[PDB]
Amino acid sequence: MHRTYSLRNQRAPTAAELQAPPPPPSSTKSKFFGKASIASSFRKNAAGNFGPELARKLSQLVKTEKGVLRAMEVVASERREAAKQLSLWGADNDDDVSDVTDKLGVLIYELGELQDQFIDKYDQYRVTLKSIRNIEASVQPSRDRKEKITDEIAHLKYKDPQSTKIPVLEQELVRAEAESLVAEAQLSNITREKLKAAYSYMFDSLRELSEKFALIAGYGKALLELLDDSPVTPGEARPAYDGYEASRQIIMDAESALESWTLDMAAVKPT
Amino acid sequence: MHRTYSLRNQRAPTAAELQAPPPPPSSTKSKFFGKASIASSFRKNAAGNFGPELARKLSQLVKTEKGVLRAMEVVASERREAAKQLSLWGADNDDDVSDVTDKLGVLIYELGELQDQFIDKYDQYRVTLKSIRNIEASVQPSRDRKEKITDEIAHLKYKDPQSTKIPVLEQELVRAEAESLVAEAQLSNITREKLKAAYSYMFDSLRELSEKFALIAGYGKALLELLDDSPVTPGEARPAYDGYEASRQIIMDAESALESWTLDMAAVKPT
Amino acid sequence: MHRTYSLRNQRAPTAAELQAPPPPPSSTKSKFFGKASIASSFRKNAAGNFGPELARKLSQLVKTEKGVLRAMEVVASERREAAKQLSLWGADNDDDVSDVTDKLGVLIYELGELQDQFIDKYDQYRVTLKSIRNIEASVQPSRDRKEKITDEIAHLKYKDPQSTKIPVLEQELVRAEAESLVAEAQLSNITREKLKAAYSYMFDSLRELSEKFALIAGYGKALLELLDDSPVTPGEARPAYDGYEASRQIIMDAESALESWTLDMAAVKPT
């Protein structure tokens, strides 16, 4: 992150914040738990309660992303209702506002739909995180077997070196040594390859959602241009709205840029 | 939106979907209400229960966005925990994975922080939506007075034209006519100006969040390049990690592009 | 401070830590309040209980440094006892150890004495912090008078513009305006000059204590050179100690460098 050289928690303002000062904190700071009700919070402790020690963190990790999915499902679905209600209010308004508002509802509807595709790809990233969780949890019992083996041979050797079980326990240590070694190496291999692929796919989904979000946001700015802000005095009639086809053409250009999106092209060019 | 010429609900695939087929639907389709618990749903009906008829839709609208804010608050805060837990797991892994993972946790932390600023600006857009709700709700009683006036004069005229209250009720109709006319005109004025300003600011916040999201996503892709996917065979040691400063420099370029973001420049260029 | 680009609290190791790994955390983590008993903690809240609002932070600040002084008084005095007890143990040991140990006790005694001078200068810095506290606390009642004045004139003007007290209250606002302005300007002046002088003197005391600490520490390292670590086998006598004058001369050089310390010279040369 970006932080200032001060004991204060507040960081240095961004160049974007220089032009527009940051708004006051949101008035939705509920005086409650604030973390996806109670069942999710109790579930969070349950992952580390009765799971393998090695995979306890991963058992939380994959399921924690389910909390991301469930919360984002509400965001996508409930914001979808906002587009429903927004375009509905356009009726009890003048024609110019009605056309702009319901068109904005279409654009927000697209915002929600793209979000839903993002949650689907997010689920796929969660699924492969579950897969690496599964193999790591399968590795753990071998570690259990190995430490049990060295514990027994150490205890038996301490008791007496003439025990007949130590000749076979020494080979059992070598047994488990090669046993654990082969899949410890592939555990690093599969973790590296799967994490790289999963997060490359996840960031690909993030880039897809991000650029689509930006394209609709900018074209909504162009859509908002057909919104007269003239302060008409009372007693005088309004000229009739005429930008019906102009807003219609704006959507067509939006759809044209929507259906012509390939990963080869990218307006965002990191340095 | 984009839909195909078919009675089927499924739409035509996007060019992005042509390269990568869409993933299967998420496994988080809970068999429950699925809309921000029950209190929000019961609250949604309450807005239209005991409110002014004109502002019933707006009373829902501004408060519905509070449901967006509350749900997004969970998303921002609970995904923030995912960055916490992800970087924590980097300990019980090789050094290369540890450096990449905790750096990814930093980038996701920035993702959450930018989300929080988005919710703050979203609250401001909700607040001005509350303001237009307030004035429209203040307009409603005049409509109540006007229809009551014409109802009384019509009923009195039907009963008898010689009633002494009709001479003053006729002027009362003109009274309320000019009364309602002046602020009906400004109601259209303030609704148009405030909606345009609020949604221009909201789309400005959306563009800000979108481009910042994309910048961090792309630089995370560059960060992921320092992740060897070589399938090392068991029994052979690994060369030591060396991309400590390379990943450090990647963040510096990310911060440099982060602190040098102005609305004058925009990589996204709509056609 | 120096922190790493990770959500982990642990920072990047220093170059000094690279040569010598950091030791495990101290075993003195008492399961108690741990902040200078209870009276100091209760006193800390008392400073902000019944004090002027403007000087509440400074009233804590100057007195908080008394907590530094009281705690450092214990450190200086109780470590002074450690030098007493250390040199005492030198009796029931061989002559070589006895000479080295009691000489080390002398050096630690000097360590304590220099600490005491540091606490004295620390008290002076605390005293001038009390002085700026006093003047700022004296400024506060004028702010009280000014806001009371504007409150009364606003309330009286709201009640009626014909009130006879408003003609004199308007001049009273100008009265307090020039009143507050003259010492607000000097408040900034005196705060800047006094804080600069106090912390320059405080850092001068810190530099004095620091370099004296280092000089005694290094000469103690030279003193420790007269300490044979040979593993003498049992049954063989030891050669008699002879470095009596060598350790005596080491102290003389230490005292010679001690009495020849001027602020013009400084081994520490910041870049």
Author numbering:
A (entry chain B), B (entry chain A), C (entry chain C): 1 to 271
What do the paper's sentences say?
Although MCC–eisosomes have been shown to have a furrow-like half-pipe structure in vivo, our isolated eisosome tubules seem to be closed, continuous helices of Pil1/Lsp1 proteins. Using a symmetry expansion and density subtraction strategy, we could refine our structures to a resolution of around 3.2 Å, which allowed us to build models of the paralogues Pil1 and Lsp1. Two novel structured regions of the protein were visible in our maps: (1) a folded N terminus (Nt) that forms lattice contact sites with the Nt of a neighbouring dimer, followed by (2) an Nt amphipathic helix (AH; residues 39–48) buried within the lipid density of the cytoplasmic leaflet of the bilayer that runs parallel to the BAR-domain helices of each Pil1/Lsp1 monomer.
The yeast eisosome, composed of the BAR-domain proteins Pil1 and Lsp1 (hereafter, Pil1/Lsp1), scaffolds a membrane compartment that senses and responds to mechanical stress by flattening and releasing sequestered factors. MCC–eisosomes are relatively stable, and have been implicated in sensing and responding to plasma membrane stress: various stimuli, including hypo-osmotic shock, heat shock and mechanical pressure, cause eisosomes to flatten and release sequestered proteins to affect signalling or transport functions. Here we isolated near-native eisosomes as helical tubules made up of a lattice of Pil1/Lsp1 bound to plasma membrane lipids, and solved their structures by helical reconstruction.
